[PDB]
């Protein structure tokens, strides 16, 4: 499969250090698809710009240095640079994901003279506002309202674009639901203008960076002890391994056989304490006293 078998670690693959808008735009214009580069940015020593070329555009995703724990590339936080490059392998930073890095120039990356991927077509897309409202509420469906400003950060399809919300969230949005600022034309009488609408006149270059826009954290506290069974957000199924074994006893009344050390993928939990999980091919009700909830993301051993 691969799709992306560039080594996500070694500087001599992807890191080109001193590049900046100046160089990055010319080396990622015209002849690239899936080609990217991470560079030392000039905003402030500590921020980086992962510029990826797809749809004949250069999407600039900024990697932000957090307080020594991990990095934050557009709100989404990953423990390190090699970690975020894996998420975008299945995310698609456009109609394509991270595939292979761009040529060499300043700091030593992979270093190719030319790329076999000759692209096709181009587009504009930048500032698009939502008129219809669509509360999909996910990273797959960007929840927008009757008057949100989005930035067309990724474009996989033509009916659905991946735009970033005011909160910087990148999700797919329907084109018939939105209107481009680069499209000033008579639709339903644009004579009333309202192009200014509401906002302060600050023409900044916001990059393609998913603009988190921190609304002042009222509750920002370090996780103490983490003795709470669920100290993480609902991302998907819950992972609990059966500490003890359960054979097909209990007189076969929805008894899910759970072996010692076996991982129970529980997707449905009843608040009584009876949970129904999918193990191998059987779904049964197991008690919380039979399993132990653990952190699915263990930084120890394997990471």
Swiss-Prot record:
The keyword Coiled coil appears for this protein: no
Sequence ranges assigned to domain SH2 in this UniProt record: 14-102
Positions carrying Phosphotyrosine: 127, 207
Gene Ontology biological process terms from the UniProt entry: acetylcholine receptor signaling pathway; anterior/posterior pattern specification; B cell apoptotic process; blood vessel development; cell chemotaxis; cell migration; cellular response to interleukin-7; cellular response to transforming growth factor beta stimulus
Any GO molecular function: phosphotyrosine residue binding
UniProt KW keywords: Phosphoprotein, Repeat, SH2 domain, SH3 domain
InterPro entries (UniProt xref): CRK_SH3_C (IPR035458), CRK_SH3_N (IPR035457), SH2 (IPR000980), SH2_dom_sf (IPR036860), SH3-like_dom_sf (IPR036028), SH3_domain (IPR001452), Tyrosine-phos_adapter (IPR051184)
Region (Disordered): 184-234
Domain of life: Eukaryota
PROSITE patterns: SH2, SH3
Effect upon mutating residue 160 to L: Abolishes interaction with DOCK5
Gene Ontology CC entries for this record: cytoplasm; cytosol; extrinsic component of postsynaptic membrane; neuromuscular junction; nucleoplasm; protein-containing complex
SUPFAM superfamilies reported in the protein's UniProt record: SH2 domain, SH3-domain
Domain (SH3) ranges: 123-183, 235-296
PANTHER family, alphabetized: CRK-LIKE PROTEIN, SH2-SH3 ADAPTOR PROTEIN-RELATED
Function according to Swiss-Prot or TrEMBL: May mediate the transduction of intracellular signals.
Entry's family note: Belongs to the CRK family.
Assembly and interaction partners: Interacts with tyrosine-phosphorylated EPOR and INPP5D/SHIP1. Interacts with DOCK2 and DOCK5 via its first SH3 domain. Interacts with phosphorylated CBLB and IRS4. Interacts with BCAR1/CAS and NEDD9/HEF1.
Name of the protein described by the UniProt record: Crk-like protein
Species assigned in the record: Homo sapiens (Human)
């Amino acid at each position: 499969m691969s799709s992306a078998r560039f080594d996500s670690s070694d500087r001599s693959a992807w890191y080109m250090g001193p590049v900046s808008r100046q160089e990055a735009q010319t080396r990622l214009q015209g002849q690239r698809h899936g080609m990217f580069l991470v560079r030392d940015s000039s905003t402030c020593p500590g921020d980086y710009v992962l510029s990826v070329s797809e749809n004949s555009r250069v999407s600039h995703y900024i990697i932000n240095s957090l307080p020594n724990r991990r990095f934050k590339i557009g709100d989404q936080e990953f423990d390190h640079l090699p970690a975020l490059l894996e998420f975008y392998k299945i995310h698609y930073l456009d109609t394509t994901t991270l595939i292979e890095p761009a040529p060499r120039y300043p700091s030593p990356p992979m270093g190719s003279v030319s790329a076999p991927n000759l692209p096709t077509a181009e587009d504009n897309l930048e500032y698009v506002r939502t008129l219809y409202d669509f509360p999909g509420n996910d990273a797959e469906d960007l929840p927008f309202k009757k008057g949100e400003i989005l930035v067309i950060i990724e474009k996989p399809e033509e009916q659905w674009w991946s735009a970033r919300n005011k909160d910087g969230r990148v999700g797919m949005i329907p084109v018939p639901y939105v209107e481009k600022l680069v499209r000033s034309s008579p639709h339903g009488k644009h004579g009333n203008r309202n192009s200014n609408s509401y906002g302060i006149p600050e023409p900044a270059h916001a990059y393609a960076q998913p603009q988190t826009t921190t609304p002042l954290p009222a509750v920002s506290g370090s996780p103490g002890a983490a003795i709470t069974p669920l100290p993480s957000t609902q991302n998907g199924p819950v992972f609990a391994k059966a500490i003890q074994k359960r054979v097909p006893c209990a007189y076969d009344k929805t008894a899910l056989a759970l072996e010692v050390g076996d991982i129970v993928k529980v997707t449905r939990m009843n608040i009584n304490g009876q949970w129904e999980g999918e193990v191998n091919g059987r779904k049964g009700l197991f008690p919380f006293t039979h399993v132990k909830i653990f952190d699915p993301q263990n930084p120890d051993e394997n990471e």
